[PDB]
Structure formats: C-alpha cells, structure tokens
Amino acid sequence: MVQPINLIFRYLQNRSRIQVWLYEQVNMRIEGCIIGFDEYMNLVLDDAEEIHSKTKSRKQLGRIMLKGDNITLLQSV
Amino acid sequence: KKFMDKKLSLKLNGGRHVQGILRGFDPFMNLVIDECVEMAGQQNNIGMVVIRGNSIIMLEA
Amino acid sequence: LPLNPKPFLNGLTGKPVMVKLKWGMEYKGYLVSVDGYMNMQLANTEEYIDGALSGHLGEVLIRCNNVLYIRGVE
Amino acid sequence: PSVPPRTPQEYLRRVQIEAAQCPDVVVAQIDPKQSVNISLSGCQPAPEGYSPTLQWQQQQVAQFSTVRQNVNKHRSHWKSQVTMPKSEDEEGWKKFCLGEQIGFPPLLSIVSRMNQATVTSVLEYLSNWFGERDFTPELGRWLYALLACLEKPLLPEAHSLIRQLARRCSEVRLLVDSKDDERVPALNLLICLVSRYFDQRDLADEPS
Amino acid sequence: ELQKREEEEFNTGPLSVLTQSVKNNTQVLINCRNNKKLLGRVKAFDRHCNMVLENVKEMWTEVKPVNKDRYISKMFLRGDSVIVVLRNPLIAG
Amino acid sequence: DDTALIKAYDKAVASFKH
Amino acid sequence: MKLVRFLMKLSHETVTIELKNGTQVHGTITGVDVSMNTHLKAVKMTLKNREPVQLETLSIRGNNIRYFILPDSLPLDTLLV
C-alpha cells in the first residue's frame, strides 16, 4: 500500500503530466505538469490546459496555481 | 478498513462513478486506485489515480 | 527548481493576473495584495462570464475557498 | 541539505520552512471607470403635512396583526361555505376583483379559499392594474385584504412585489393637493404595513 | 497577545476591504451565491468572511429581465455564501 | 362577518386623523 | 472563531434563515453550535411552489444556511464583544 502523497510526490519527481478532476465542475478538467505543491495539496502547475468536455477543446493557461480544495481526482497522461 | 487489493466501484460527486482495485488509503480518507476505468456511455481506463476522501458519495465492491 | 505555491503566489503580486473561480466566473486584474489563507485583492478588476467581459468592478476582494486557480498575465 | 528530498514528509517539511521564510502577507503598491449597478428607488417622502405620526403608524400595525390573527384563526370554516379565476388569468382576476361586472369584494369566504401562490399572483395583477389606472377604494380593500392573507416568512420575490407597491403609492401621493383627498389615508396605510409590518423599514415614513 | 498580528493583517492584505467598511461606515457590494448581490455596511467579520451586516439591500434581476430588491435591517452572512466583495461600489437610481 | 375585512379596512382608512 | 461566538448568544431570538435551496425558514432559536448548526422551534417554512409548513421544531446544518435575517431590535454592539 502506497499512501497517495507518495503518488503525488512521484508525479513531482518525474515531473509527470497529469489530469485533475474538479470538485465543483464536471464539464472540465485541468492538465499540466506539476512543479510544486503543499500540505493543502495546492499545486503549482506548468504548461497547463483547460480541457473541456464534448467540445474536445484545450485552452492554454501556462503556469497556474491550482487550489487543493478543488481536487476530486489525479491521474497521469 | 479491511478492503485491500479488492476490486471496487466508486461514485464521486457530480454524478460520476469509477471502478478500480484499491492499492492504498490515507488518514484523510483519500485513496489510491489502480487499473481504474471511468464508466460514462462506454468507459475507459485511467491506470492509477488518486481520490479525495470527499467526492466519494458511495463505494461498493 | 521546484516552485511552490506560496512563493509562486507572492511572485504574482503587483502584476496582472487572471483568477478563475470554482463556479466558472473569472476575474482579471492587478494583484494588489494577498495573505496567509490566500484571499486576494484585485484592482482595476474585470468581469468575464462564459468568456464575456461582464463588468468593471474596480477594487475587489476574493475569498480564497472560491478560487479554482490563479495565473499570471501580461 | 542540498540533496533533494526523498519522502514527501521531507518535502512537505522542507516546503514549510520555506513558507515561514516568506512574508505572510504582501501588498503591491501600484501607480495609476466601473460599471454601475442600478438600484431601485426608495419611497417618495410625503408632501409636507401629509406624513402620518408614528403613533398612528404603530397603532395601525398593531391593529393589522390582530386582523391576520383572526383571518388565520378562521380560514378553515370559511374555506367551505363566483367562479374564481384561474391562478394565471390576470385579466380574469382584474375583472373579477375590480370589474369594468362591477367587482367582487374580498370577503373572508373568497380570500380564505386562496392559496399562497395565488395571493401573491393576484397582488401582482392588481399592482399592474394599479400602475395603469387610478387607485380606488375597491383597490385598497383588495390590496389590504391580500396583504392580510400573506403569510410570513415571505419569499424574496413577494417582498419585492410589495415594495414596488409601496413605491407606487408614494408616487401617487404626490399628485394629491388636499388632505381631504380620499386616496391619502389609504396610501399612507399601505405604505405603513409594508414598511412597518412587513419589515421593509427603508420605505417607511419616518416623519419630520 | 500574538493574536495582535491578526488585526495588522486585517488593516492591509485583502481583508482590508471589509475593515474599511467597519472603520469608516462605508457600504460594500457582495456577490452572493444565491446569484444575488448584497449592498450593505459591515458591522463585523472574521477570517472566513462570516459577516454581520447592517442596512442590506438584496438586489437581483429576473424575468426583458426586471430588477428586484428587498431590504434587510440586520444580517448574519456566512462567508461560504460570499464570492467577491467590492470596495467602493457604484450604484445609481 | 363575511365582510370583516372590507370592514377592517374602512375602519383603518377612517382611523386616519391629521 | 469569534463571529460564531456571537451566533451562540442568540437563543430565544426569532429569525428568518435563507437556506441554500432558497427556502425561507422562520423560527425561534433553541441553540447554535460551534459549526453554525441551528435548532429552532416554532417553525414556519416558506417554499418556492408549495404552501407553508408549520413545525414544532427543526434543526438545520450550518452548511445549508445562506444567511440569517436578524430581528431589527437586536442590539448588535452589545453582542459584539
């Protein structure tokens, strides 16, 4: 068993590209490479993209900070 | 909390559910899922992913 | 070379930023100030609902828990 | 120290130190036009000498409440004792309460049959009529009546509705030139219940 | 005594916006999650933006869309319900 | 008193003296 | 944690509460807890498309509240201490 933080940490070491499932919002996901975070799970996120649903469209954000409260789910890409 | 490496199906808020096998869990009740797939509409896989304690209305096997 | 959220956040102050809320409205303005909990204060604030400029609000305070993400702009 | 960290705890702990290393709150001084939010009007102050005394206004409220205390006490009996238009038939209602036949006063045997949504609906209709016609005693009675039948706590929309009504009353008050004008007593009264009784004290006539 | 810092943090930093209203008896405009707007004076507040307000106008439009409002003498607003807060809003009849 | 409202009203309107 | 200290002083005050669903709830406070959960008695609930509801009592979650409408007579400056 690997407590998730290890998995988040891993994503930071590899500097993996990830997708985030937003709590309040189902029509949209965020995608970016993770370059920092903290105990609230706030994420600094590089080269980031809003992916919208149905519409198959991707909006360039650049470097953003994502709040931790918004996160339902994290995957890799 | 005895469920481990036993396949699970999950319902997250906003009406979305997913199925995968538990590989881990944290005190915060946020847990790691493997070989998961998101079941729309046919579904598809997301490999290993993390999930918040909240956002998980129900969880069944 | 890891950039972490507070330092990054303090980094944005005094510059144009675009802030997006967990409800889909978003605000563009100058990040006048910020604090421990990451509430934020914006000046010369703009309104863009569903991508449409909706209003000019001048100086505005944003409760943190509302924020989805914040990003820099030029 | 200078070696990357290997476990999150270390990373989380390493970050925290960094955080303290950061000023908690910052304030960027900057160097140098906004939309307007339209807000509905207050009430129109009464022409001098027409504003009612508080004691009157207080006495009326206290009285009004009793009336609602009884109307509610005997709703069921009256409920079962003149085809009452559909809820959404504005015109039909308008004709009904007011007439061009002549109108159907607001008896306890008719109002009591009236459900909340409808009461609200009718006021509207009556208000709309009001804006576009002269206030008549028949109006007053109906408006007063329905107000009698409104049950707190009021929905926000209801609140707005009665407010617009008050604002119109005040507006019509301006046209008047003698205290002997019939409208005045009624208009003041209406702007008293909705101002005092229904808690919209921003609309009230605090005299002098 | 350390708590003292809290108030210095309120005099500047983004909560200043509210402490303005409390200090000067100014009105603010709050966008609310009811999808309505509240225009009032702040009597008190905490770090969550829970608030005590005075003389509040609840404003909204509805429908083509008409403006509606309603008045509220005294109010306890949960911070949760708050989205943004305008300092020195601009309002007009 | 199936018209105790109509009455109450009149009573109020007439209760105005100034 | 000091605005919520104020709510708790409001027993026996009757108020109206907007719920998040928009329901207006009028009643008398029996007690408020430290997470804003409110127990009322003598309750009247106003619903969008449904007549009202009387209830002897009702208790409400702090996180279902939009705000409290307080009695106008309420003396604030006193209670803010």
Numbering used by the authors:
A (entry chain E): 14 to 90
B (entry chain G): 10 to 49, 52 to 72
C (entry chain F): 3 to 76
D (entry chain 2): 42 to 73, 79 to 127, 133 to 151, 173 to 280
E (entry chain B): 15 to 77, 88 to 117
F (entry chain M): 35 to 52
G (entry chain A): 1 to 81
What's written in the study?
The assembly of snRNP cores, in which seven Sm proteins, D1/D2/F/E/G/D3/B, form a ring around the nonameric Sm site of snRNAs, is the early step of spliceosome formation and essential to eukaryotes. Gemin2 is the acceptor of 5Sm. SMN binds Gemin2 by its N-terminal Gemin2-binding domain (Ge2BD, residues 26–62). By binding the outside of the horseshoe-shaped 5Sm and constraining it in a narrow conformation, Gemin2 helps 5Sm select RNA substrates, allowing preferably the cognate snRNAs, containing the snRNP code, to assemble into the inside of 5Sm to form subcores; the assembly of cognate RNAs widens 5Sm, which in turn causes Gemin2′s release and allows SmD3/B to join to complete the assembly of Sm cores.
Since in the previous structure of the 7S complex the N-terminal tail (N-tail, residues 22–31 visible) of Gemin2 is located inside the central RNA-binding pocket, it is possible that this N-tail induces the narrowness of the 5Sm. To test this possibility, we reconstituted Complex C, a derivative of Complex A with Gemin2ΔN39 replacing Gemin2, for crystallization. The crystal of Complex C had the same space group as Complexes A and B and similar unit cell parameters to them. However, the curvature of 5Sm is still the same as that of the previous complex (Data not shown). The absence of Gemin2′s N-tail did not change the curvature of D1/D2/F/E. These data demonstrate that Gemin2′s N-tail does not play a role in the narrowness of 5Sm and the narrowness of 5Sm is caused by the rest part (residues 40–280) of Gemin2. Superposition of 7SΔN with U4 Sm core or U1 Sm core (Data not shown) on SmF/E/G reveals that there is no clash of Gemin2′s N-terminal domain (NTD) with RNA, and on SmD1/D2 reveals that there is no clash of Gemin2′s CTD with RNA too. This indicates that Gemin2ΔN39 and RNA are not spatially exclusive. However, the binding of Gemin2ΔN39 on the periphery of 5Sm inhibits RNA assembly into the central RNA-binding pocket of 5Sm, allowing only the cognate snRNP code containing RNAs preferably to assemble into the Sm subcore.
